[model samples]
Target: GSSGSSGAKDALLLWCQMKTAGYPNVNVHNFTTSWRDGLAFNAIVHKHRPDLLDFESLKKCNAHYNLQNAFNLAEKELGLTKLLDPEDVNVDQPDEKSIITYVATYYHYFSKMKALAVEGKSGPSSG
Candidate 1:
């Protein structure tokens, strides 16, 4: 889950769906404040198409670069660019957590097929 508020999440989802969807190449032209949103969608695609691992990796990396570029551009445009040392404390910045939630959700939904098979008796007959 993301640390951002509902407003942030709403905005990210909007831009990701509207803007990023157009960029099939997943290049820097796709701008959004939420990198996690980009990765989340990428992971969704990757889960369904495991054979496209290489292409997905490329797309993810490019999307990451786009998010970074957008972040930097916002800072510069707003004149809020600051030089922070490694020890600097920034609590307000949002960060990406592990993708475990997405992965788990994927497996949960995918495993439903197995559950359905057993319940429907489509896999094997009971003795």
Candidate 2:
């Protein structure tokens, strides 16, 4: 009955990534800057990490794509969004381990989503 939670973390990570990437910004500076920077980074990634580029690779218009609605729906289905606040300072940290944990969780969620997408494409049931 709660199958939606299976993808909730991925949706959350996608939302966070897009937001941190300054997606919704339309100002001239943000637009031009993110465009230039994302392209440059993509080029570097393409050269050094072509495999990364092949997985959920960013399209030219990817920065402008909006996934907020998908994330909101996922949160509503999973009933968990306030569980972690990246800006919260109340947590006790030993050498910022807590922050590292959060980052690692985000990384896992993003990686899992990409892997699942690849599997879906190559699986026998992919018709």
lDDT of each: 0.37, 0.34
Per TM-score, the best of the predicted structures is: 1
Give lDDT: candidate 1, residue 123.
37
Error of 2 at 18 (Å): 8.2
Model 2: per-residue Cα lDDT at residue 115: 62
Q: What's the residue-level lDDT of 120 in candidate 2?
A: 36
Top lDDT: which candidate number? 1
- Candidate 1 per-residue lDDT over residues 20-107, each given as its tens digit: 4544544322222233334434433344454534333455444444333333432344232322211121123333232222223333
For residues 14-106, what per-residue lDDT tens digits would candidate 2 score against the true structure?
Answer: 443453454233211222132222332233223333553431345545421212222232235423252323223122332233333333333
The candidate 2 region of ten consecutive residues with least summed lDDT is 26-35
Off by over 4 Å in 1: 1-12, 27-68, 78-127
State model 2's lDDT: 0.34
Per candidate, the number of residue pairs that clash is: 0, 0
